[model samples]
Target: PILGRFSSHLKIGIVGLPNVGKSTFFNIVTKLSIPAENFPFCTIDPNEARVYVPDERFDWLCQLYKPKSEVSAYLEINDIAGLGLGNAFLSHIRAVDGIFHVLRAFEDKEVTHIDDSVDPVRDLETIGEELRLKDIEFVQNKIDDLEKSMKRSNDKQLKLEHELCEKVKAHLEDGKDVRFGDWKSADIEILNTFQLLTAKPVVYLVNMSEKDYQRKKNKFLPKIHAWVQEHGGETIIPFSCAFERLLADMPPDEAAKYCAENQIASVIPKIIKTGFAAIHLIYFFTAGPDEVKCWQIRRQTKAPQAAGTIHTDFERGFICAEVMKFDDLKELGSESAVKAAGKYRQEGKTYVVQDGDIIFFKFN
Candidate 1:
């Protein structure tokens, strides 16, 4: 029997109208510059990169693994071109796990704005409309295909899918994003199959000017936040692509110095933290001399499922897991102390893994 691990990785899509600094933000976050321009549609194709989530637990694990190299948890980000006038790649948006809607909050005399001025509200509305329109097209097509299939076959699965598509279509017709659509568990399962672009979670990114960054409380951020709230989204964060890129290249100490000198605290960390929260992601560790690794999983994942993320045989063998909280182990200073303190527990197949768990699976 072979064991496996079932880890989760989130892919965040950077989306916005043309010349909204989406590419600049992506460059700062990923610390890589593919290409960024002053005009709209500079990024004609999606640019992708993997970024490591900074975690202290992983640092400690590095001491344990001592593998002559460091391994960290990662998430993928894609710098997608602005979806103006519902051009090509509108359907590709549905495949993303989440959205970082980059809104232009700065005024520049040189760079041309798609809507002819800096109106964050109008920019957000245009992007939202585009996404909603794309989803409407998706649902309509699914409904048509299902109707034809129902006429030809007596498949129960097809019947269920047909009903689900109709429900989704009804929601779209009301001018609502699929994420806002009231979906039952079964409906959610069916909905996942369609991968509707608007169905993914979204976070609005306000690319503010240097003056706005110093103000601490900006005129644009609150309005954008309110708009996101009214539209049924969770969080909106302010970002300074110019500042972020400048700081990404500096050392931690130097970056702190620069931030304090300029009265600018880096917003990238906040964006990352918020991104993790929006996705409900949890981190777990696997430690040993061979390799100490950090893994990302959804909150409340079961032990067997978590184990499956590592190897299928580990899950298939069906054995208990020796689990300890990372903080407890770190506080005690050793694994033996953690065991002695009774903090270590043997969890069976039903154990739902928690964030920051240090787990060792025992299998046949």
Candidate 2:
């Protein structure tokens, strides 16, 4: 039933101008062979999947417990067709909790560039500018609506919203992201409703060629990193979609052997790890003979709220939780050994749950 539960799935959108390997990257991650041809607008419809979060800890627990059913935490990935087809796809981008901005660093004469050149930084700026323009227009419209509503009667909600909209519009006009703003908690509460495109966190991805990736070099990496530093300093990962296709086609051992023989490593794991962290998520485990499931939550979540992720009644009628570190269990070799070593804990309402925790909630 852990797989059946829907509330825990938070989405990360893969977006970029057409033919940047956005669809290719999504297919590799999701293991779905959707068409990722050499042309722009190849992927005309949005696609998505609940991709597994690969954790050795989850693997270890499932191995140790030998559970009847095993479940890993999942992060949803939505491929928004491809950006720059038009601004209409912005609606899909707005729905994600975070973004994977795919910028092409690979130069294949076969795969034509939209602007007739291969410039990753320019591509990044194009996407950023498009999203910002969308946000600016959004706030501009919001300000007009708020002002029109206030013309008839004095509304405190409208007044406060209008002020925030103006402030945000100015920030966007200055070519800054909403994520980089110095805003108060109250301002954020209101802004969340606005669903501004730039407000979502981003992790930039550079798609390089197989040889370039193996050599651990990309000409655009320096420029992209510099641009990232100037723009809120989000994490940027360089990968090779061509390399991933090679891995996908080979058997697991053959893939590992190929990487080893070539002295190259896949950036797929790093992409998933970075994407998970960028979205402000951490996960804990629930291990038993029946199932071993991973539960996702925001960072700094308390024990009771963490318990709430398992069941509503467990949180409402919460007493406390027995917790143990995954590392402790791995080191000690069993839950009994973890308890014996005094690594097990009884956490209360105020306890901020740590990542890799194995928890058991006590309730009425």
Candidate 3:
């Protein structure tokens, strides 16, 4: 329920053009093999999953605390059916928080490129065009609704909304997105109304062939990074979904051994880490022998709102936060040691949470 206000829970959405190994990536990431045929719109509905967020700190804490069971932090992803620029499938894209765009950068004759040739750059632009148009459509629809609503009431918020919608509509019509530029607080409130598709973050996954990952080289690498860099917190992660799927099919140890033997690192952990970051997600923790857990929140969240994530009582009866840094816990070896070192502190409601903070809330 962040800016996007999507069914994705503001989680990242997996999107790409047809026959670009999207199903395989989804299968690997979500472990859901939803009949990945050479298909379009096979994703009649979005495949949803609460993927366990990969965190070494969570694992280490489990080892140290010996909790009954650890609840890992997680994110949701909608592996949409392969989509076209301006098709019904795009509804799936518009519903999610951000996009993990799987671009066609590999040439598998057997796989058969959907296009006459493989061009990641061109594919990116085509997706961009469709997303922009979809955004324009969304904004126009919002403006039309606001126009009618404003007529019914002289509410100040509605009037402010009309002005903001007009500006956003103008930008979309001009083929631009709402990046975190000189935006006012009203701008955030306005955009949150429908969570424009163009407003979602886009991170590119260059679907590369194994030989080219570090050897043959991609001609579009520079352009991909250069363009992705334009968006705040977006990232480019190069990977071959086919290889990863096969690797994922193996037993855990064998999967680790396979990557070690081939010198090809596992991209799943990187995906979990960076994908969350792409959507501007951050982590905080709660640790003990009974449970060692991690929680996800948008960056810049304050203590009270974050406490509300666990229970209303935590926020309603909010008092203070007892906090410790993860690094200090690691170095000092335990909470008592951290306390002895004076590394722990009692923070107030105004405290802005930081990443990797181990928190124990003091509430009524």
Candidate 4:
């Protein structure tokens, strides 16, 4: 089993009506081109990539994992289309760990916005309503199936699920997000099993026009921000994916210079950074000559749990870990020097792993 060292490198699903620039954003951030076009449903299936977010700790790890190529922690991004196709494809959205709701904020006569014109607030509402409707349909179906099963077995577990579904149904009816409803950890666990799309955390990505990027406040941004806030969700910093894609072909220094001169922040890094923070992910290093790798783990993870992320055997045979903070290692210059300076510490299983902990696990 591929256990995550950090729970933070969660799989984020990009969903929206077709032609909303979801594919464009994916390409810009992952630095890979999938078949993006002007037509609807172009991305018929999900396209996935492991996108590395630049971290300074990765540099420190290279010192330890010397002679081996350095590896950085990454988040998995999934671009899924046909979401607006209707209720049949609702299960696709439910399966994702989180939602990156991309709204088309740019207006171009050449490319048509799915809703006929560029209206960020309306687009935001349309996507939210579609998800709500899908959840309602899902709950209704589950209710029907549970009622039928209850007659045959009178099972307590089925009965609980049935009742929870009704609670979710009621919340949806009140125009409330399922995530915002009072749900116990066990209730959330049950919901996770169902893979309800509306239950996942969602962040709105406003795909802005190049013109809007220069403005401190965007006309479309406020409405989208308000809608997400009202629905207990959050909005990411606005950017133009179309423009970023154009810059990507340029030399790195040239692109940086162009962006700085224009006061434009590339949407790719902003979105990726926001995505990672939204999921609460952190990075740790495993350095050696064979493989110098960066691993993502959830915040507050224990030492052994993080070890399990690399290999189950390491966790099962877990002992103590010789750990050094990346900052300390950087200041002290090397692992040996850090040990000589007494900056390295032996951490037990109970040690809550911190971001940038360069660990060498000692196991049986």
Q: Pick by TM-score: which candidate is best?
A: 2
Q: What's the best-to-worst order under lDDT?
A: 2, 3, 1, 4
- Across 1-364, the per-residue lDDT of candidate 3 in tens digits comes to 2355522146678888777888788877667322344236333334866567878888888899988868776666888755545465676766677788888777765755464577777777777777777777777777788889988988888778878878887776665667643467668766777777777877778887776773637766777777666645467788877787777788989978877888776677788778887787787899887888888888878999888888889999999989999999999998899999999999999998999999999899
Summarize candidate 2's per-residue lDDT along 116-210 as a digit string, tens digits: 57798877787788889988988999989889999997869889889989999999999998888988878887887776788888898899888
Model 3 clash pairs are none
Shift of residue 349 alpha carbon in model 1, Å: 2.0
Mark the 10 consecutive residues where model 3 has the least summed lDDT.
Answer: 32-41
Give candidate 3 regions above 4 Å deviation.
1-8, 32-46, 82-90, 109-115, 148-159, 214-216, 229-233
- The per-residue C-alpha lDDT of model 4 at residue 27 equals 72
lDDT of each: 0.73, 0.81, 0.76, 0.73
Q: What is the overall TM-score of model 2 with all chains considered together?
A: 0.87
Whose lDDT is higher: candidate 1's or candidate 3's?
3
The backbone clash count of each candidate, in order, is 18, 0, 0, 6
By TM-score, the candidates rank as 2, 3, 1, 4
Per-residue lDDT of model 4, residues 245-342, tens digit only: 77887998998898899887666666776677566677777777777776888777889988888888779999988889888877987778998999
| Candidate 3 TM-score over all chains jointly | 0.85
How displaced is residue 229 in candidate 3, in Å? 4.4
